[PDB]
Amino acid sequence: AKFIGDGNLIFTKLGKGSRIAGVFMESTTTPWVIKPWTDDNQWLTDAAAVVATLKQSKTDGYQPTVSDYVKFPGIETLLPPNAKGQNITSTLEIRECIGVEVHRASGLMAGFLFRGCHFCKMVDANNPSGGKDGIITFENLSGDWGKGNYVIGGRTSYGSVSSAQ
Amino acid sequence: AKFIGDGNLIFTKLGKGSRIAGVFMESTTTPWVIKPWTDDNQWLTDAAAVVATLKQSKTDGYQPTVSDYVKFPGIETLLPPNAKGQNITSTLEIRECIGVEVHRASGLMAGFLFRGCHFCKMVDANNPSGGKDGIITFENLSGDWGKGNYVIGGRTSYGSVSSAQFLRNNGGFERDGGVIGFTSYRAGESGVKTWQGTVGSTTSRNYNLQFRDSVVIYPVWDGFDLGADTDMNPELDRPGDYPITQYPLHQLPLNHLIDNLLVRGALGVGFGMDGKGMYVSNITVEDCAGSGAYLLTHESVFTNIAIIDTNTKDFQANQIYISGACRVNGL
Amino acid sequence: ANVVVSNPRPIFTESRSFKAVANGKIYIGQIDTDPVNPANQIPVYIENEDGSHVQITQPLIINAAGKIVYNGQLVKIVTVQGHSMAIYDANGSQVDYIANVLKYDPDQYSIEADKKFKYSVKLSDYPTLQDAASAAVDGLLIDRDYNFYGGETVDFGGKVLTIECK
Is residue B127 within 8 A of residue B99, CB to CB? The reply is no
d(CA A78, CA A143): 41
Chain A, nearest residue to C142 by Cα: A17
Is residue B38 within 8 A of residue B123, CB to CB? The reply is no
d(CA B224, CA B294): 11
> Is B84 exposed, middle or buried (CB count within 10 Å of its CB: 0-12, 13-18, 19+)?
middle
- Residue B222 is among the residues annotated as catalytic for this protein: yes
How far is Cα of residue B178 from the mean position of the Cα atoms in its chain?
12
d(CA A125, CA A121): 12
- Tell me which DSSP letter residue B136 carries: E
What are the helix and strand counts (H, E) for chain B? 3, 27
Residue A25: name the closest of A48, A1, A46 by CA: A1
Residue A158: name the closest of A137, A138, A136, A128 by CA: A128
Is residue A131 within 8 A of residue A162, CB to CB? The reply is no
Residue C141: name the closest of C105, C112, C111, C165 by CA: C165
Report strand pairing: B90-95 vs B32-33.
Answer: unpaired
Task: Please provide the DSSP assignment of C17-60 as one string.
Answer: S--B--SEEEEEEETTS-SSSTTTB--EEEE-TTS-EEEE-SSE
Query: What DSSP element (H or E) covers B9?
Result: strand B7-11
d(CA C20, CA A119): 71
Q: Cβ–Cβ of B173/A39 closer than 8 Å?
A: yes
Task: Please provide the DSSP assignment of B181-237 as one string.
Answer: EEEEE--SS-SEEEPPS--SSS----BS-EEEEEEEES-SS-SEE--SSSSS--SS-
Is residue B129 within 8 A of residue B106, CB to CB? The reply is no
Task: Please provide the DSSP assignment of B259-311 as one string.
Answer: -SEEEE--SS-SEEE--SS-EEEEEEEEEESS-SEEE--SS-EEEEEEEEEE-
Chain A neighbours (≥3 Cβ pairs under 8 A) are B, C
d(CA A97, CA B245): 62
Looking at the DSSP bridge assignments, the partners of residue B73 are none
d(CA B216, CA B67): 18
B19 interfacial to chain A (CB closer than 8 Å): yes
- Residue B259 is among the residues annotated as catalytic for this protein: no
Chain B residues whose beta carbon lies within 8 Å of the beta carbon of residue A39 = 173
Residue B95: name the closest of B190, B181, B9 by CA: B9
| Strand runs labelled E in A31-132 | 32-33, 55-56, 101-105, 108-110, 121-125, 129-130
d(CA B276, CA B326): 9
Residue B121: name the closest of B248, B16, B265 by CA: B16
* Nearest-neighbour CA in chain A from C165: distance (Å): 6
Residue A60: name the closest of A8, A119, A130, A162 by CA: A130
d(CA B152, CA A156): 13
d(CA A50, CA A66): 14
Please tell me which residue in B93, B133, B225, B274 is annotated as part of the active site. Answer: B225
d(CA C32, CA C43): 17
| Strand runs labelled E in B89-197 | 90-95, 101-103, 110-115, 121-123, 129-130, 136-139, 150-152, 157-158, 164-167, 178-185, 192-194
Residue A37: name the closest of B172, B251, B278, B168 by CA: B172
Is residue C133 within 8 A of residue C140, CB to CB? The reply is yes
Query: What DSSP element (H or E) covers B70?
Result: helix B66-71
Could you give the strand order of the β-sheet that contains C77-78, starting from the edge strand earlier in sequence? C53-56, C44-47, C77-78
CA dihedral B289, B294, B300, B306 (to 10 degrees): 20
* Nearest-neighbour CA in chain B from A74: distance (Å): 25
Q: How far apart are the first and last CA of chain B?
A: 51
B153 interfacial to chain A (CB closer than 8 Å): yes
d(CA B206, CA B257): 12
Report strand pairing: B261-264 vs B210-217.
Answer: parallel
- Tell me which DSSP letter residue B108 carries: B
Residue B101: name the closest of A23, A22, A128, A20 by CA: A22
- Tell me which DSSP letter residue B65 carries: P
**Upper half-sphere CA count for residue C111 (Cβ side, 13 Å):** 10
Comparing CB atoms, the residue among B17, B152, B176 nearest residue A24 is B17
d(CA B203, CA B181): 27
Chain B neighbours (≥3 Cβ pairs under 8 A) are A
Technique that determined the structure: cryo-EM
Residue C140: name the closest of C124, C114, C120, C126 by CA: C120
Domain CATH code at residue C90:
2.170.14.10
Chain C, nearest residue to A15 by Cα: C166
Give the residue numbers spanning the domain of C79: 13-103
Q: Cβ–Cβ of B123/A124 closer than 8 Å?
A: yes
B123 φ/ψ angles, rounded to the nearest 5 degrees: -115, 115
| Percent of residues in chain A assigned helix, strand, coil, to nearest 5 | 10, 25, 65
Instruction: Please name the amino acid found at residue B120.
Output: C
A126 interfacial to chain B (CB closer than 8 Å): yes
* Nearest-neighbour CA in chain C from A18: distance (Å): 7
**Contacts by residues C85-89 (CB-CB < 8 Å, ≥ 24 positions apart):** C85/C26, C85/C28, C85/C35, C86/C26, C86/C27, C86/C29, C86/C34, C86/C35, C86/C36, C87/C12, C87/C21, C87/C24, C87/C26, C87/C62, C88/C24, C88/C25, C88/C26, C88/C27, C89/C14, C89/C21, C89/C22, C89/C23, C89/C24
d(CA A91, CA A111): 5
- Tell me which DSSP letter residue A118 carries: B
Residue B214: name the closest of B145, B166, B254 by CA: B166
* Nearest-neighbour CA in chain A from C162: distance (Å): 14
Is residue B117 within 8 A of residue B96, CB to CB? The reply is yes
d(CA C76, CA C67): 11
Q: How many interchain CB pairs under 8 A, A with B?
A: 46
Chain B residues whose beta carbon lies within 8 Å of the beta carbon of residue A41 = 172-173, 208, 255
Listed in sequence order, the residues at least 6 apart from A89 whose beta carbon sits closer than 8 Å to its beta carbon are A6, A7, A27, A63, A109, A110, A111, A130, A131, A132, A133
Residue B153: name the closest of B130, B123, B126 by CA: B123
> Is B20 exposed, middle or buried (CB count within 10 Å of its CB: 0-12, 13-18, 19+)?
middle
Comparing CB atoms, the residue among B18, B99, B174 nearest residue A157 is B174
Chain A residues whose beta carbon lies within 8 Å of the beta carbon of residue B16 = 22, 24, 106, 126
Q: What is the largest CA-CA distance in chain A?
A: 51
d(CA B184, CA B105): 14
Q: Identify the residue among A26, A104, A108 best suited for mutation to test binding to B, counting B beta carbons within 10 A and taking the highest.
A: A104
CA angle A145–A148–A151, rounded 5-degree value: 110
d(CA A62, CA A161): 9
Chain A residues whose beta carbon lies within 8 Å of the beta carbon of residue C164 = 17, 19
Is residue B171 within 8 A of residue B207, CB to CB? The reply is yes
Q: Cβ–Cβ of B153/A154 closer than 8 Å?
A: no
- Residue B40 is among the residues annotated as catalytic for this protein: no
d(CA B97, CA B204): 20
Chain B residues whose beta carbon lies within 8 Å of the beta carbon of residue A21 = 17, 19
Comparing CB atoms, the residue among B99, B180, B208 nearest residue A126 is B99
Neighbours of B189 (CB within 10 A): 22
B152 interfacial to chain A (CB closer than 8 Å): yes
Instruction: Please name the amino acid found at residue B233.
Output: N
Is residue A138 within 8 A of residue A119, CB to CB? The reply is no
